[PDB]
Short mmCIF file of C-alpha atoms and ligand atoms in Angstrom, two decimals:
data_model
loop_
_atom_site.label_atom_id
_atom_site.label_comp_id
_atom_site.label_asym_id
_atom_site.label_seq_id
_atom_site.Cartn_x
_atom_site.Cartn_y
_atom_site.Cartn_z
CA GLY P 1 -26.75 123.50 5.17
CA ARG P 2 -26.26 126.43 2.72
CA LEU P 3 -23.00 128.38 3.71
CA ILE P 4 -19.39 127.32 3.78
CA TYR P 5 -18.05 128.55 6.97
CA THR P 6 -14.27 129.21 7.45
CA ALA P 7 -12.82 129.45 10.98
CA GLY P 8 -9.45 130.60 11.98
CA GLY P 9 -6.24 130.25 10.08
CA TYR P 10 -2.91 131.85 9.81
CA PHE P 11 -1.51 134.98 8.31
CA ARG P 12 1.38 136.51 10.37
CA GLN P 13 -0.23 135.03 13.33
CA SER P 14 -3.15 132.72 14.12
CA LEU P 15 -6.53 134.39 13.30
CA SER P 16 -9.88 134.51 14.98
CA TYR P 17 -11.95 135.11 11.96
CA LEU P 18 -15.25 133.25 11.27
CA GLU P 19 -16.64 134.10 7.95
CA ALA P 20 -19.30 132.29 5.70
CA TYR P 21 -19.60 132.08 1.89
CA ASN P 22 -22.71 131.66 0.19
CA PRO P 23 -22.20 129.88 -3.16
CA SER P 24 -25.73 130.72 -4.28
CA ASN P 25 -24.96 134.63 -4.32
CA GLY P 26 -21.11 134.91 -4.11
CA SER P 27 -21.57 136.72 -0.69
CA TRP P 28 -18.92 136.77 2.21
CA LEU P 29 -20.43 137.47 5.83
CA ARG P 30 -18.23 138.00 8.72
CA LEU P 31 -19.62 136.48 11.87
CA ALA P 32 -18.57 136.18 15.61
CA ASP P 33 -14.86 135.69 16.15
CA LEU P 34 -13.60 132.53 17.84
CA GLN P 35 -12.98 133.18 21.46
CA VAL P 36 -9.32 132.20 20.97
CA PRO P 37 -7.10 132.78 17.80
CA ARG P 38 -6.14 129.35 16.21
CA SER P 39 -4.71 128.03 13.08
CA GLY P 40 -4.15 124.23 12.11
CA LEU P 41 -7.77 123.43 13.47
CA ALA P 42 -10.39 121.42 11.85
CA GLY P 43 -14.14 122.27 11.21
CA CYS P 44 -17.06 119.85 11.33
CA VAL P 45 -20.72 119.84 11.81
CA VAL P 46 -23.08 117.82 13.84
CA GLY P 47 -26.78 118.43 14.25
CA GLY P 48 -26.52 121.79 12.45
CA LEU P 49 -23.70 123.08 14.89
CA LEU P 50 -20.42 124.07 13.77
CA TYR P 51 -17.27 122.72 15.70
CA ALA P 52 -13.85 124.17 15.75
CA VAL P 53 -11.45 121.34 16.84
CA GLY P 54 -7.70 121.57 17.91
CA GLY P 55 -5.07 123.89 16.30
CA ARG P 56 -2.61 126.25 17.85
CA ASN P 57 -2.43 130.02 18.73
CA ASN P 58 0.71 131.22 17.01
CA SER P 59 0.90 134.60 18.57
CA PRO P 60 3.66 137.23 19.29
CA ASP P 61 3.22 136.68 23.07
CA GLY P 62 3.63 132.88 22.75
CA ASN P 63 2.71 129.70 20.75
CA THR P 64 -0.11 127.51 22.47
CA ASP P 65 -1.26 124.33 21.02
CA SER P 66 -5.03 123.79 21.48
CA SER P 67 -7.03 120.83 22.98
CA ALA P 68 -10.20 122.95 22.59
CA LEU P 69 -13.46 122.17 21.31
CA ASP P 70 -15.83 124.98 20.52
CA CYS P 71 -19.22 125.13 19.10
CA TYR P 72 -20.90 127.84 16.94
CA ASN P 73 -24.62 127.93 16.72
CA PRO P 74 -25.68 129.86 13.51
CA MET P 75 -29.17 130.55 15.21
CA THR P 76 -27.53 132.65 17.92
CA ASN P 77 -24.18 133.76 16.17
CA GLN P 78 -22.37 132.73 19.56
CA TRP P 79 -19.44 130.42 20.38
CA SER P 80 -19.59 128.15 23.33
CA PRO P 81 -16.89 126.02 24.59
CA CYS P 82 -17.34 122.17 24.87
CA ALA P 83 -15.00 119.70 26.81
CA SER P 84 -11.57 119.79 25.84
CA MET P 85 -9.70 116.94 24.29
CA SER P 86 -7.14 114.54 26.31
CA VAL P 87 -4.15 116.33 24.56
CA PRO P 88 -3.34 119.47 22.37
CA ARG P 89 -3.52 118.62 18.68
CA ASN P 90 -2.18 121.24 16.05
CA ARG P 91 -2.47 120.38 12.51
CA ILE P 92 -5.41 118.04 13.32
CA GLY P 93 -8.00 116.24 11.26
CA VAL P 94 -11.54 115.34 11.96
CA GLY P 95 -14.23 112.92 10.72
CA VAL P 96 -17.87 112.68 12.01
CA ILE P 97 -19.45 109.16 12.24
CA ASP P 98 -23.05 108.71 13.46
CA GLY P 99 -23.13 112.29 15.15
CA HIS P 100 -19.73 111.63 17.00
CA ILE P 101 -16.51 113.56 16.32
CA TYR P 102 -13.29 111.85 15.81
CA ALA P 103 -10.23 114.00 16.46
CA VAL P 104 -7.21 112.38 14.75
CA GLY P 105 -3.36 112.87 15.16
CA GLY P 106 -1.95 116.37 15.18
CA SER P 107 1.05 117.72 17.29
CA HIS P 108 1.83 118.89 20.81
CA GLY P 109 5.18 120.65 20.75
CA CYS P 110 7.63 118.03 19.18
CA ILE P 111 5.07 115.02 20.03
CA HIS P 112 3.38 113.79 16.81
CA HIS P 113 0.29 111.87 18.01
CA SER P 114 -0.85 108.59 16.71
CA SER P 115 -3.79 108.75 19.05
CA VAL P 116 -7.40 109.32 18.18
CA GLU P 117 -10.25 110.36 20.45
CA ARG P 118 -14.04 110.42 20.05
CA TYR P 119 -16.41 113.34 21.16
CA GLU P 120 -20.12 112.54 22.02
CA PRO P 121 -22.17 115.69 21.78
CA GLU P 122 -25.14 114.27 23.98
CA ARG P 123 -22.74 113.78 26.82
CA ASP P 124 -20.17 116.43 26.03
CA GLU P 125 -17.42 113.88 26.76
CA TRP P 126 -14.29 112.90 24.71
CA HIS P 127 -12.88 109.22 24.92
CA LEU P 128 -9.81 107.77 23.32
CA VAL P 129 -10.09 105.07 20.82
CA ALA P 130 -7.45 102.76 19.22
CA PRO P 131 -4.47 104.78 17.98
CA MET P 132 -3.53 105.00 14.30
CA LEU P 133 -0.60 102.68 13.06
CA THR P 134 1.21 105.74 12.21
CA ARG P 135 1.97 109.19 13.84
CA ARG P 136 0.40 111.73 11.56
CA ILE P 137 0.10 115.60 11.69
CA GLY P 138 -1.35 117.53 8.86
CA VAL P 139 -3.36 114.37 8.45
CA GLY P 140 -6.31 114.26 6.04
CA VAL P 141 -9.39 112.83 7.35
CA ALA P 142 -12.58 111.54 5.78
CA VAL P 143 -15.69 109.21 6.29
CA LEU P 144 -17.21 106.95 3.77
CA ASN P 145 -19.74 104.32 4.57
CA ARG P 146 -19.28 104.94 8.33
CA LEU P 147 -15.55 104.06 8.15
CA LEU P 148 -12.92 106.84 8.95
CA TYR P 149 -9.82 107.28 6.93
CA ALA P 150 -6.65 109.05 7.76
CA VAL P 151 -4.44 110.01 4.89
CA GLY P 152 -0.97 111.35 4.48
CA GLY P 153 0.51 113.70 6.90
CA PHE P 154 3.94 114.10 8.85
CA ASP P 155 5.24 111.64 11.17
CA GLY P 156 7.83 113.65 12.78
CA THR P 157 10.57 112.58 10.16
CA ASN P 158 8.89 111.81 6.98
CA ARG P 159 6.02 113.15 4.99
CA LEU P 160 3.65 110.12 4.10
CA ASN P 161 1.93 108.75 1.20
CA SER P 162 0.44 106.15 3.55
CA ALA P 163 -3.19 105.98 4.65
CA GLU P 164 -5.22 103.79 6.90
CA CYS P 165 -8.82 103.08 7.71
CA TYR P 166 -10.58 102.63 11.16
CA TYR P 167 -13.33 100.12 11.68
CA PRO P 168 -15.31 101.29 14.65
CA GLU P 169 -17.19 98.11 15.47
CA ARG P 170 -13.61 96.48 15.63
CA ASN P 171 -11.88 99.56 17.25
CA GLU P 172 -9.08 98.78 14.98
CA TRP P 173 -6.97 100.53 12.26
CA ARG P 174 -5.71 98.76 9.15
CA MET P 175 -3.53 100.31 6.31
CA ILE P 176 -5.08 100.82 2.94
CA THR P 177 -3.49 101.22 -0.44
CA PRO P 178 -1.08 104.20 -0.22
CA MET P 179 -1.55 107.17 -2.40
CA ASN P 180 0.60 107.74 -5.57
CA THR P 181 1.95 110.98 -3.94
CA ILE P 182 3.61 111.93 -0.61
CA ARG P 183 1.27 114.65 0.93
CA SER P 184 1.12 116.43 4.24
CA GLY P 185 -1.50 119.10 4.85
CA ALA P 186 -3.56 118.19 2.02
CA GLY P 187 -7.31 118.63 1.77
CA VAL P 188 -8.94 115.34 2.17
CA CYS P 189 -12.85 114.89 1.80
CA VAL P 190 -15.29 112.33 0.34
CA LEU P 191 -17.36 112.72 -2.68
CA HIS P 192 -19.66 109.98 -4.01
CA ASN P 193 -17.77 106.58 -3.45
CA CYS P 194 -14.24 108.17 -3.38
CA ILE P 195 -11.79 109.69 -0.84
CA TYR P 196 -10.13 112.80 -2.51
CA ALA P 197 -6.63 114.16 -1.49
CA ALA P 198 -5.96 117.50 -3.03
CA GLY P 199 -2.57 119.27 -2.76
CA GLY P 200 -0.29 119.26 0.30
CA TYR P 201 3.32 119.50 0.96
CA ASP P 202 5.96 116.85 0.50
CA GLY P 203 8.85 118.60 2.39
CA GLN P 204 10.04 120.20 -0.75
CA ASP P 205 7.16 121.39 -2.64
CA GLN P 206 3.36 122.55 -2.31
CA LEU P 207 1.40 120.47 -4.73
CA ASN P 208 -1.54 121.14 -7.27
CA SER P 209 -2.25 117.42 -8.02
CA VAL P 210 -5.25 115.61 -6.84
CA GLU P 211 -6.07 111.88 -6.52
CA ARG P 212 -8.99 109.79 -5.31
CA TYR P 213 -9.36 106.34 -3.68
CA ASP P 214 -12.13 104.18 -4.84
CA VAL P 215 -13.01 102.04 -1.82
CA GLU P 216 -14.32 99.31 -4.12
CA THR P 217 -11.40 99.04 -6.17
CA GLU P 218 -8.76 100.07 -3.41
CA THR P 219 -6.85 102.12 -5.95
CA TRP P 220 -5.87 105.82 -6.14
CA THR P 221 -6.39 107.75 -9.43
CA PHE P 222 -5.34 111.34 -10.37
CA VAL P 223 -7.85 113.61 -11.58
CA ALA P 224 -7.37 117.11 -12.89
CA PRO P 225 -4.81 119.27 -10.88
CA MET P 226 -6.08 122.44 -9.04
CA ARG P 227 -5.11 125.72 -10.62
CA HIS P 228 -2.94 126.63 -7.53
CA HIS P 229 -0.36 124.54 -5.86
CA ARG P 230 -1.39 124.65 -2.18
CA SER P 231 -0.80 123.02 1.33
CA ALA P 232 -2.46 123.72 4.69
CA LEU P 233 -5.79 124.22 2.64
CA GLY P 234 -9.34 123.91 3.83
CA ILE P 235 -11.52 121.53 2.06
CA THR P 236 -15.19 120.89 2.07
CA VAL P 237 -18.15 119.64 -0.02
CA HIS P 238 -21.16 121.80 -0.77
CA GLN P 239 -23.96 120.53 -3.27
CA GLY P 240 -21.74 117.70 -4.62
CA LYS P 241 -18.74 119.85 -5.60
CA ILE P 242 -15.47 120.08 -3.59
CA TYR P 243 -14.30 123.38 -2.54
CA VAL P 244 -10.72 124.25 -1.55
CA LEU P 245 -9.88 127.32 0.50
CA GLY P 246 -6.76 129.06 1.09
CA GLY P 247 -3.39 127.45 1.95
CA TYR P 248 0.33 128.16 1.05
CA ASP P 249 1.88 127.89 -2.33
CA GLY P 250 5.62 128.65 -1.22
CA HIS P 251 5.21 132.27 -1.86
CA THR P 252 1.86 133.55 -0.77
CA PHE P 253 -0.77 132.84 1.87
CA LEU P 254 -3.61 132.31 -0.71
CA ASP P 255 -7.01 133.90 -0.91
CA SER P 256 -7.88 131.54 -3.74
CA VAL P 257 -11.18 129.45 -3.38
CA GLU P 258 -11.42 126.71 -6.18
CA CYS P 259 -14.24 124.36 -6.82
CA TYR P 260 -14.15 120.72 -8.50
CA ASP P 261 -16.74 119.60 -10.83
CA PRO P 262 -16.44 115.76 -10.93
CA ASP P 263 -18.78 115.46 -13.91
CA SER P 264 -16.36 117.70 -16.13
CA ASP P 265 -13.43 116.97 -14.25
CA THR P 266 -12.48 120.80 -14.03
CA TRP P 267 -11.39 122.99 -11.38
CA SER P 268 -12.60 126.73 -11.49
CA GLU P 269 -11.84 129.71 -9.49
CA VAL P 270 -15.10 130.68 -7.46
CA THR P 271 -14.40 133.48 -5.30
CA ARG P 272 -11.56 134.67 -3.01
CA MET P 273 -11.61 134.71 0.72
CA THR P 274 -11.58 138.42 2.20
CA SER P 275 -7.93 137.73 3.07
CA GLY P 276 -5.20 135.24 2.30
CA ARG P 277 -4.70 132.62 5.13
CA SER P 278 -3.57 128.95 5.73
CA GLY P 279 -4.59 126.41 8.21
CA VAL P 280 -8.44 127.24 8.24
CA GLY P 281 -11.11 125.00 9.51
CA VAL P 282 -14.00 124.60 7.08
CA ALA P 283 -17.47 122.95 7.23
CA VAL P 284 -20.96 123.48 5.71
CA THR P 285 -24.21 124.42 7.53
CA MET P 286 -27.19 126.65 7.54
CA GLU P 287 -27.50 130.34 7.16
CA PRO P 288 -27.23 132.29 10.59
CA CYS P 289 -30.80 133.04 11.75
C1 LIG B 1 5.18 135.16 8.84
N1 LIG B 1 5.57 134.31 7.64
N2 LIG B 1 5.76 134.87 6.44
N3 LIG B 1 5.93 133.86 5.64
C2 LIG B 1 6.11 132.68 6.27
C3 LIG B 1 6.52 131.40 5.97
C4 LIG B 1 6.50 130.31 6.98
C5 LIG B 1 6.78 128.87 6.65
C6 LIG B 1 7.73 128.83 5.35
C7 LIG B 1 9.07 129.51 5.61
O1 LIG B 1 9.63 129.59 6.68
O2 LIG B 1 9.53 129.89 4.54
C8 LIG B 1 5.46 128.17 6.45
C9 LIG B 1 4.63 128.56 5.59
C10 LIG B 1 3.26 128.01 5.48
C11 LIG B 1 3.10 126.80 6.16
CL1 LIG B 1 1.60 125.96 5.98
C12 LIG B 1 4.13 126.25 7.01
C13 LIG B 1 5.36 126.94 7.10
C14 LIG B 1 6.21 130.68 8.39
C15 LIG B 1 5.87 132.00 8.66
C16 LIG B 1 5.67 133.02 7.66
C1 LIG B 2 6.86 125.17 3.96
N1 LIG B 2 5.55 124.46 4.03
N2 LIG B 2 4.67 124.27 3.10
N3 LIG B 2 3.62 123.80 3.58
C2 LIG B 2 3.90 123.20 4.64
C3 LIG B 2 3.09 122.33 5.42
C4 LIG B 2 3.71 122.13 6.88
C5 LIG B 2 2.98 121.23 7.90
C6 LIG B 2 2.96 119.74 7.34
C7 LIG B 2 4.35 119.30 7.38
O1 LIG B 2 5.21 119.68 8.04
O2 LIG B 2 4.64 118.05 6.59
C8 LIG B 2 1.54 121.62 7.96
C9 LIG B 2 0.36 120.75 7.70
C10 LIG B 2 -0.93 121.23 7.82
C11 LIG B 2 -1.08 122.58 8.24
CL1 LIG B 2 -2.89 123.19 8.44
C12 LIG B 2 -0.02 123.49 8.36
C13 LIG B 2 1.13 122.87 8.18
C14 LIG B 2 5.08 122.40 7.20
C15 LIG B 2 5.77 123.28 6.39
C16 LIG B 2 5.15 123.71 5.16
#
């Protein structure tokens, strides 16, 4: 892949935007809109295709949680619907293992899901797997060494520092070491041998702190803070660097895009999105055409 794709998000209402940033030249490209506006969704890529998963359409004419999975083909610049999930999942997290998409947690109205389901592109089918031990919305999800991690979030009552791991061949969840920080709507991704959790909301404040979990040591360590406090950010990895996109700082719907260089342990401002927004879906794949 070469571009960072950001899909959907929220500013005043849920958004249909699909725009792609090229780190190699600083350029933004506006591409085909989502068929349905949505915020609180997740993005991922499988086989070169971009998927938009879950979310909610917050709109003046009503609020609708999304069970939708939609597929964007950069070759054609077209969105195609796929099979829908078992349930709507706003403020979802997702992870890809072995070409399958895991949809994790999220909300449907006042239901905070612990349920998890898995999509198989070759069959266009979703199937439920073992539920998490905890209900989590605004859940951070990442994959390392073909294990799936669910990190932080909101269980309906408390924002969470807890995290858990799913072992596919056991179809089983187990708790891991909790983070040192309560975080809901953080950005969670993998880089090298570590799960990173950037920012989030704790029920009182939006956070700039960043910590990472080393699967070998089973401990969380803080790294340098982002320049901007943010919850409901998008996060992705592009060429061995973390990028964080948008979110909310308690005052502004951020257009800020920051990137993290693990070797210098520094965050730097890279570009700004064309407009401020929170709750985007983000993933990396090839240039269109
Ligand atoms: C249209 N508009 N303008 N400012 C807003 C703030 C919120 C709340 C916070 C509040 O109510 O102050 C909110 C903002 C961001 C997240 Cl991620 C979650 C909730 C909701 C809609 C808003
Ligand atoms: C005022 N404020 N600031 N940041 C917030 C985040 C949420 C939730 C998580 C929660 O309720 O803990 C949220 C999580 C993820 C996404 Cl994409 C969007 C919203 C709710 C209010 C918030």
